[PDB]
Design an enzyme around this catalytic site. Structure first.
Site, mmCIF file in Angstrom:
data_model
loop_
_atom_site.group_PDB
_atom_site.id
_atom_site.type_symbol
_atom_site.label_atom_id
_atom_site.label_comp_id
_atom_site.label_asym_id
_atom_site.label_seq_id
_atom_site.Cartn_x
_atom_site.Cartn_y
_atom_site.Cartn_z
ATOM 1 N N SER A 142 -0.632 -37.451 123.183
ATOM 2 C CA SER A 142 -0.323 -37.382 124.616
ATOM 3 C C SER A 142 -1.472 -36.812 125.447
ATOM 4 C CB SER A 142 0.947 -36.575 124.862
ATOM 5 O OG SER A 142 2.081 -37.381 124.650
ATOM 6 N N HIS B 166 3.675 -52.381 130.409
ATOM 7 C CA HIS B 166 2.734 -51.280 130.219
ATOM 8 C C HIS B 166 2.410 -51.054 128.718
ATOM 9 N N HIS C 126 6.883 -43.375 118.766
ATOM 10 C CA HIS C 126 7.537 -42.109 118.511
ATOM 11 C C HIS C 126 8.978 -42.325 118.070
ATOM 12 C CE1 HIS C 126 4.331 -40.700 121.344
ATOM 13 N NE2 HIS C 126 4.294 -39.719 120.463
ATOM 14 N N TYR D 110 11.445 -40.432 118.620
ATOM 15 C CA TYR D 110 12.409 -40.095 119.679
ATOM 16 C C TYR D 110 12.652 -41.268 120.628
ATOM 17 C CZ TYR D 110 8.143 -38.977 122.301
ATOM 18 O OH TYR D 110 6.915 -39.058 122.898
ATOM 19 N N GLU D 111 11.774 -42.274 120.566
ATOM 20 C CA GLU D 111 11.959 -43.500 121.369
ATOM 21 C C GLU D 111 12.946 -44.493 120.754
ATOM 22 O OE1 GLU D 111 9.842 -42.705 124.885
ATOM 23 O OE2 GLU D 111 11.233 -44.300 124.411
ATOM 24 N N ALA E 262 -0.255 -33.556 120.956
ATOM 25 C CA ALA E 262 -0.061 -32.395 121.799
ATOM 26 C C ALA E 262 1.057 -31.576 121.180
ATOM 27 C CB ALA E 262 0.248 -32.804 123.258
ATOM 28 N N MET F 97 6.574 -33.578 118.201
ATOM 29 C CA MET F 97 7.629 -34.563 117.947
ATOM 30 C C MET F 97 7.036 -35.823 117.316
ATOM 31 S SD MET F 97 9.562 -34.167 121.593
ATOM 32 C CE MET F 97 9.745 -32.587 122.314
ATOM 33 N N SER F 98 5.827 -35.702 116.754
ATOM 34 C CA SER F 98 5.179 -36.882 116.199
ATOM 35 C C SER F 98 4.389 -36.590 114.940
ATOM 36 C CB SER F 98 4.215 -37.436 117.248
ATOM 37 O OG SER F 98 3.121 -36.572 117.328
ATOM 38 N N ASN G 259 1.076 -26.177 125.524
ATOM 39 C CA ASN G 259 1.913 -25.163 126.127
ATOM 40 C C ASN G 259 2.239 -24.087 125.098
ATOM 41 O OD1 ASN G 259 4.779 -26.164 124.929
ATOM 42 N ND2 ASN G 259 3.505 -27.901 125.592
ATOM 43 N N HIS H 88 6.331 -32.085 130.707
ATOM 44 C CA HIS H 88 5.395 -33.098 130.228
ATOM 45 C C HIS H 88 4.135 -33.304 131.130
ATOM 46 C CE1 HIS H 88 4.067 -36.224 127.602
ATOM 47 N NE2 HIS H 88 4.088 -37.124 128.574
HETATM 48 N N1 LIG Z 1 6.232 -27.272 123.151
HETATM 49 C C1 LIG Z 1 6.411 -28.596 122.556
HETATM 50 N N2 LIG Z 1 7.467 -28.819 121.601
HETATM 51 C C2 LIG Z 1 7.644 -30.189 120.944
HETATM 52 N N3 LIG Z 1 6.719 -31.333 121.326
HETATM 53 C C3 LIG Z 1 5.646 -31.102 122.319
HETATM 54 C C4 LIG Z 1 5.457 -29.758 122.932
HETATM 55 N N4 LIG Z 1 4.313 -29.846 123.910
HETATM 56 C C5 LIG Z 1 3.767 -31.234 123.896
HETATM 57 N N5 LIG Z 1 4.601 -32.007 122.895
HETATM 58 C C6 LIG Z 1 4.383 -33.425 122.568
HETATM 59 O O1 LIG Z 1 4.019 -34.099 123.813
HETATM 60 C C7 LIG Z 1 5.234 -34.761 124.246
HETATM 61 C C8 LIG Z 1 6.090 -33.716 125.019
HETATM 62 O O2 LIG Z 1 5.316 -33.142 126.062
HETATM 63 C C9 LIG Z 1 5.913 -35.229 122.935
HETATM 64 O O3 LIG Z 1 5.402 -36.505 122.597
HETATM 65 C C10 LIG Z 1 5.574 -34.159 121.894
HETATM 66 O O4 LIG Z 1 5.153 -34.701 120.671
#
Ligand SMILES: Nc1ncnc2c1ncn2[C@@H]1O[C@H](CO)[C@@H](O)[C@H]1O
Ligand SMILES: Nc1ncnc2c1ncn2[C@@H]1O[C@H](CO)[C@@H](O)[C@H]1O
Ligand SMILES: Nc1ncnc2c1ncn2[C@@H]1O[C@H](CO)[C@@H](O)[C@H]1O
Lengths: 279, 284, 280
Positions: C32, C60, C82, C84-85, C112, C215-216, C239, C253
């Site tokens: 990301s 896109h 992903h 989650y998609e 990220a 999440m990836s 973050n 995000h």
């Molecule tokens: N604090 C967080 N916890 C889980 N996923 C995150 C986090 N910050 C960035 N991501 C990633 O970037 C996206 C969410 O901002 C998702 O694709 C995830 O993989």
């Protein structure tokens, strides 16, 4: 096919045509442990292919016979969730046993040892489990409850029958291999990757003694329908907790440790069965 | 089942809007044995789930299927008598629909109750545990209710769950318990969700306790995630309907009937507590 | 969707091989906000996922980019898939198995993540040295189902999954180029998502031994190790996880994309410098 009373009855009635043995005891052999079935006398081997609605290097077998005077049915080869099987598929064989007359289920499996006091080749009797998939919405009982088999919300208290555990210990003791025998908590990893060192350390810290990718789903289905359960893990490898180590788990080494202890384990089960109360 | 997208949710909401004129500001969901929190609703309209297109059916014991509209302590409420549980086989979309429908009906605040086992060793049977946070085990393991295309009309792709259990509502609920003499039954803690439907083993309970959980149940978190996702404020309370067993050598076991029983004994106190909370909610 | 078996993977790979002559040794996946790690690719051929049969959409559409980087032939996935998609296991696995048939030997991935480890700062890089696969433990492992023998074994070991020689090199390169102080190594835990983690979830993940959460990534790494591709993976701390339920600070995000945009050029430079020193 849904593991409801109708379909389970079908499969059970078919089997009942191919054999006259009414099993009181069911046995399931884990990885490399197929020999626990070789002392079965007056045996009838029914390949899974001959059974309608059962599932599928070659096929598995349902073996009927007697062992230490008692009638048994042995599942040579189990069904694993990591293989893609549905909940209904894994549940069916256990519910079929129930309708065949099984009262006690004895299950073995191969596992990695998390507990640092375990040695390769040790036996760990399960006294409890941590069902990670079940906690996360992949519990084998998810879906409509089949009321003919059990209750909507089963309790898992004394799931690993404490009298069977005591007897198993006493038999190991009397036959000179008490020192191989431990009792502990089995945690299920859905698999099929072995656990990373980070995952192993976490599982150890949660209170787990051995880790594997099977067994819990069968045990849940069995307790759900009131079959008593005895379960044992063979420690076929020592989990690696350290990411800098070159040592790794390998399925051939699992089969190899299985082969080395299969006879001792077979002997153990036979001696346990001989001492089961007979009513 | 039907996607909980803006089109399908609109349909269900418009249908309901024909069977009633009540515009709910507050939504209430009753957990196992807690159906009585709905019995003080005045000027009520009871709509069975069967008379709503695309709503579900509910087949759990201690959950009838009715949507009840009326007023409570002066405010307009809708009450889900009977919820939908993942351990029953329902899809994400099915569990997410009723909450998204509430959103379109006007709901701003969601009050949820549930029955739970007490992990925290200081809890007593019959205690109330306000949720201040949760651990969504199925969600961590890829069974999050939001998995799938994000429905943009409802919320953002990646919702934050900070202050998910609105801290002003929690403060108010405590103060009301206190003033009405039952502050001593009230705790606040972390709820963990077990997909179920097996009760937790002693080794699972020990592990859950050690992870920081106070109570465990098989519901609630999915609804809360959908509600925060679409901007509904949330208040949630567990009734401790059993004490979790941490010891494998114990003969004591959880039983659904005892859960329903404890629910029945406390349902009136809980109903009274919710009515008193709603009476003090800010009003615009 | 289409099974990531040897037949289907061969189809996709043969089609791609008609649209380009580059035989990639190195595969790159951008996380990301990190799409810039692909902009230094010389003699590039951009192939949108739409112009490939049986590839997905990440709508896109993104792009499969072929070219050279620091002298080496690379293929770049601009935009990943992903869980989650709602994508299937087979869909996420296919691109990585395609890379394998294209000739990829090394896979470099970025993502990220939230910083759990309390010594992390915003914008730090955390090289993965290990990973907790929560979905995998819970019966949502990408390899669940019939094993595709043409690619790998039934029960893969994940020892040295994050190749320790690549990790050592990456560290040395950061060091020599003056930004060693931004580089850590740790354990990545995957949350299926898409909700960010609650404070109780974060506290629990920290206590289990995790340094970053995202999440990836893990699914791709499993598929890569299963078919014998070597792996390097880095998280950008976009973050700081909030452990305290009384805090008003929250992940969003946009701030993730913003941190990504601030560090993308430094990360691109880091990757190019690592690739330059890969054994040949
Ligand atoms: N604090 C967080 N916890 C889980 N996923 C995150 C986090 N910050 C960035 N991501 C990633 O970037 C996206 C969410 O901002 C998702 O694709 C995830 O993989
Ligand atoms: N260290 C281990 N972790 C998880 N499963 C194992 C382990 N060792 C043996 N097994 C079992 O044997 C097979 C993998 O070798 C699987 O069926 C699995 O259940
Ligand atoms: N000890 C417990 N563990 C998990 N869920 C429980 C417990 N006690 C009551 N419940 C809840 O009530 C029902 C089980 O009796 C389920 O809907 C579940 O959410």
């Amino acid at each position: 096919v849904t593991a409801n009373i109708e379909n389970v009855k079908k499969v059970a009635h078919h089997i009942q045509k191919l054999t006259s043995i009414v099993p009181e005891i069911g046995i399931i052999c884990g990885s490399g442990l197929g020999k626990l079935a070789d002392g079965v006398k007056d045996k009838i081997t029914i390949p899974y292919t001959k059974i309608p609605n059962f599932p599928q290097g070659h096929s598995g077998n349902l073996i009927f016979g007697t062992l230490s005077g008692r009638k048994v049915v042995v599942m040579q080869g189990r069904f694993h969730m990591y293989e893609g099987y549905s909940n209904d598929t894994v549940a069916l064989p256990i519910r079929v046993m129930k309708l065949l007359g099984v009262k006690i289920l004895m299950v073995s499996n191969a596992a990695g040892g998390l507990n640092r006091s375990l040695k390769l080749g040790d036996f760990v009797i399960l006294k409890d489990h941590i069902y990670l998939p079940g906690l996360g919405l992949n519990n084998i009982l998810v879906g409509p409850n089949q009321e003919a088999f059990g209750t909507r919300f089963p309790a898992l208290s004394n799931a690993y029958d404490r009298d069977l555990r005591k007897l198993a210990v006493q038999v190991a003791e009397e036959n000179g291999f008490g020192n191989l025998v431990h009792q502990g908590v089995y945690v299920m990893n859905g698999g099929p990757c072995y656990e990373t060192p980070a995952e192993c350390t976490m599982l150890l810290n949660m209170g787990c003694d051995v880790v594997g990718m099977s067994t819990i789903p069968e045990v849940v289905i069995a307790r759900h329908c009131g079959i008593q359960v005895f379960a044992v893990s063979l420690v076929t490898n020592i989990s690696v907790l350290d990411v800098e180590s070159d040592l790794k788990p390998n399925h051939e080494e699992v089969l190899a440790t299985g082969a080395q202890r299969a006879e001792l384990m077979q002997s153990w089960f036979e001696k346990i069965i001989e001492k089961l109360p007979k009513d």
